[PDB]
């Protein structure tokens, strides 16, 4: 249980962008998504002891109406130097895969 | 598929032909040497045979030469640890 | 090609490894029914 | 074999029950039939 997932959630929806260029995009992704709609929090997973980007990034949007238009418009859109690929966030943490294992046997 | 993709799909059997006859085409008698060693692989390629370069790189992709040497070294030290005392060996040392 | 199930290899049918037999001969079967004046029918029937 | 299609039996009971729910609302309850029979029979004289 990493103590960093708790900086986006306000029951808001997270888009998962991957296939991103590891030489850049630390705040380029925020720059690109900031036009729709306002100030938000968008991270990029750059792993420690290396400073290298692991690819994927999480942009947390205020609305699931905002989300559909953002996803449809910026799918494959040239961002830094690799076309971003967009999916929905998993967040399969403990309190949901316990429920999933309880739903397995039922 | 596109005309270029149909071209490449018909050059695939030339790739398997070149890879098949590689030990007698990629020798030094056949192409006088400008011996370019293949990258991260111990193969020398006498003559620029680019089809053979692609096939032998795709065989030895993902550092297979070093993995083969590492597996053979570690399996041989497994043999020498299995047969330590009955050859009068103190220990083995996997050299750096 | 695996050793076909002979009468000296069928003893391996009954160990812990679960084995199935698939007999597909009776899948497609017909009945050939005559009336004398007119013609002759063949009815495809169900199989297993 | 009874357990899995017992689950899906409860789920198809849920499905047929939801069909009967969507027929249960939007039903012309007891007097919406009466006002629609009235607006059928009472013309615009």
């Amino acid at each position: 249980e990493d103590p960093s997932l708790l900086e986006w959630d306000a029951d808001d929806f997270r888009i998962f962008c991957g296939d991103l260029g590891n030489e850049v995009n630390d705040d380029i992704l925020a720059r690109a998504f900031s036009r729709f709609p306002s100030f938000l929090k968008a991270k990029v997973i750059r792993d420690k002891r290396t400073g290298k980007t692991k690819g994927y990034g999480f942009v947390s949007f205020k609305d699931p109406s905002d989300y559909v238009r953002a996803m449809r418009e910026m799918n494959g859109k040239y961002v830094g130097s690799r076309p971003i690929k967009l999916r929905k966030s998993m967040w399969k943490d403990r309190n949901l895969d316990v429920v999933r294992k309880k739903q397995k046997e039922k | 598929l596109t005309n270029a993709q149909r071209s490449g799909l018909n050059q695939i059997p030339n790739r398997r032909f070149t890879l098949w006859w590689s030990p007698t085409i990629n020798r030094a008698n056949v192409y006088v040497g400008f011996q370019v060693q293949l990258d991260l692989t111990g193969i020398f390629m006498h003559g620029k045979i680019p089809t053979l370069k692609i096939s032998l790189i795709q065989i030895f992709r993902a550092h297979l030469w070093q993995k083969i040497h590492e597996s053979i070294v570690m399996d041989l030290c497994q043999v020498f640890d299995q047969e330590l005392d009955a050859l009068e060996i103190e220990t083995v040392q996997k050299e750096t | 090609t695996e050793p076909y199930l002979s009468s000296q290899n069928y003893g391996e049918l009954f160990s812990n490894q679960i084995i199935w037999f698939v007999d597909d001969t009776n899948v497609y079967r017909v009945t050939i029914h005559k009336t004398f004046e007119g013609n002759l029918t063949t009815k495809p029937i169900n199989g297993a | 074999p009874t357990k899995v299609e017992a689950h899906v039996r409860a789920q198809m009971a849920k499905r047929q029950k939801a069909h009967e729910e969507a027929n249960a609302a939007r039903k012309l309850t007891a007097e919406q039939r009466k006002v629609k029979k009235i607006k059928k029979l009472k013309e615009d004289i």
Binding site: - | - | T1, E2, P3, Y4, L5, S6, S7, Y10, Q17, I18, I19, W20, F21, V22, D23, D24, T25, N26, R29, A48 | -
Partner: protein, 48 residues
């Protein structure tokens, strides 16, 4: 747990399509049979 890992075809013209249709299960063994078993006798009993 109930899937087999050994399947025996009575009629020899079925193990070659069974090789194709069971590439999702490479763990299973598709052998032919030298002994054929009369499962048309199952058709002959009135219940089946």
């Amino acid at each position: 747990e109930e899937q087999p890992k050994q399947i025996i075809v009575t009629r020899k013209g079925m193990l070659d399509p069974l090789e194709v249709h069971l590439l999702d299960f490479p763990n299973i063994v598709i052998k032919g049979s030298e002994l054929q078993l009369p499962f048309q006798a199952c058709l002959k009993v009135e219940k089946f």
